[model samples]
Target: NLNQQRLGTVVAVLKSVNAKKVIDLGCGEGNLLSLLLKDKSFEQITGVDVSYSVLERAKDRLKIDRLPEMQRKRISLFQSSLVYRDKRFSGYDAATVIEVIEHLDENRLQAFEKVLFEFTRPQTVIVSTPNKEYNFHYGNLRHRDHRFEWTRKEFQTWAVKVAEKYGYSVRFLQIGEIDDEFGSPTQMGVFTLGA
Candidate 1:
């Protein structure tokens, strides 16, 4: 499944950057959290979503009680929105926002940036979003719900600006096959605190 494949790529990037204490922003139903659990490097894993019912599904999916308390206590799920401040999001080593940003309307994008980069200020951030260039692969029209889809250049431009403003360094990676001209179906931005 491409969904799992995409998440596998996210997990790989997280490890390459040597991240721990990861918070999955917009963590809908905790699919990534399951993969994160297999890696002990992530000492603490947090899943945050705006929906209470989704979080409940995530808890049931994880079978939280099946694991020992020591392992169980390491994972947490909470109700939170991407546009608002939650002091609990602070102090994580890294944050993962998989396929979340496009859902936000243009004006809310800045608030999303501020909450993650300025307020929480995680040491690293891994983000994945649709590559508008590759929309041809699906059809002319993009997904119905995404507010906007960005081409690779657009994505890189935004990431570079964010990194500069936040005092972090960023590099781009491709998910799915790369076209010689347009690149991959998905483009990822990996942001780290050092140069």
Candidate 2:
């Protein structure tokens, strides 16, 4: 319901880091890494999530072990928490924390951003979350974990702050450049490079 539209923003953010490796934090089922691997130039794509059950689904989706050796070698997964103290997520080319984080308590959101965006300082991060204004979209979703959703203005403001305070520039793609009324009711945040 959300990701395909956000793919454009992801690609837009990735072009600058061509051939760079990446990590998809809270990469539930790993769809982003699967699409990204098509580029053939990515340094590596590792997906991290708290749930091993979902990671198994991601592994199956990519058919990881059956791929040609070259492709298979470049993708992998690590079972880890997003706010872990160690920089297991560091030194990568970029990072994509898509449709994650909204699950956290709002009070901890800033701390979450500072630790990952400021401290680890990856070159890029593409984040997508349900746009609050489009409460209409939620009518069809089921059993989601979103604690709170933000309007485009709210999301962009927080994203800009995440980039600026952490040393990066932020951009908005509004889901595939679809500027129509219904376009990105799913705000996609593209954060990149300043450190």
Candidate 3:
């Protein structure tokens, strides 16, 4: 139910935003990309992942090669890391880092922030991560691989600070049920630069 809600909200948010080109940083298996492709408003959709094997899986799921040339032209997959600067990320209208930040170490977050906002400088950026405050609803803290989850306050604090530094305005939202005390299960932050 969490993922279902997340996918629904993510697509809705992306569709509402006026962006023709979108970059999916840490796209993984492309489940989110598959949904993004359904919308014709996005003339370009590119997925970047650190693992070649994972990108291959994303490609198989998206079937860019099997599609017609026109359809294929809108889709692209690349092997890259978000922690470093990549020229391929520039000139995009929007960028998404869905459920990927919790995997990064606390130290690398600054680099990740710079590469996305200062470097690529997308007009709109959407980021989603698990809410550590909501972990009490579950049995454990979070996935074994996740480096660190953030409480809603922590997430909001970090996002707002970064947004200010990069000359962007940001809004924070949540996914799944809203608990009065714990807040939502998944927290999302949307940052927008100039029109």
Candidate 4:
């Protein structure tokens, strides 16, 4: 499934970069957190979401009460908004914003960018969103809550601009099945802090 592949790809990239302290910016139910917990290399893992109920759901999904003390110590979850600066978000080696941006209104993206790329300023950042061009295959937007989806070009253009403004170098990646004209179902931008 594309969801599985997306999660796997994100985890692989985090591993390749040797990120010890990691944060998932919009982690809804702790799916990526579950994978990160299984890997000993990730010493500190954090998940943040705006909803308190959602964070509670993530806690249940992760079975926090059942985890060993050492594993439990390695992970934490917080309730916070991505568009607002929060001191708790700093000091992570890497941050992932998986399938979360589409839900934000286009007008709020600039604030979101500064919060993630400027204030938080992780060494590496990964962001993924649905490819608008590929929606033809699905017949409609994948989720009702998504404020908007971007074509690959739109995504890249925005990513490049953010990277340039924030002093990070970025490269694109495709996720899920590829189509000859529409490209992949998901588009990702991986940003690295320096040369």
Pick by TM-score: which candidate is best?
4
Candidate order by TM-score, highest to lowest? Answer: 4, 3, 1, 2
lDDT of 3: 0.85
> Model 1, range 99-151, lDDT digits (tens) per residue?
68877777778899998888878888998999987755543454453337887
- Please give the distance, in angstroms, between residue 176's alpha carbon in candidate 4 and its true position after superposition: 1.4
Reference-based lDDT, residue 58, model 4: 95
**Backbone clash tally for model 3?**
0
For every candidate, C-alpha RMSD to the true structure in Å: 2.4, 3.0, 2.3, 2.1
Clashing pairs in 4: none
> In candidate 1, which residue ranges exceed 4 Å CA deviation?
138-147
Q: Order the candidates by lDDT, highest first.
A: 4, 1, 3, 2
Query: Candidate 2: which stretches are off by over 4 Å?
Result: 136-147, 176-183
Report the lDDT tens digits of candidate 2 across residue range 13-126.
686667378888888888788888887767688888889899999999888989999898888797875565556777877778777767677756766686578655787777
- Candidate 2 residue pairs in backbone clash: none
Q: Write model 3 residue lDDT over 94-121, tens digit each, in one string.
A: 9999877777777777888998899889
Residue pairs with backbone overlap in model 3: none
- Ranking 3 against 4 by lDDT, winner: 4
Output candidate 1 Cα RMSD: 2.4
User: How displaced is residue 172 in candidate 3, in Å?
Assistant: 0.8
Show how many residue pairs clash in every candidate, following the order shown.
0, 0, 0, 0
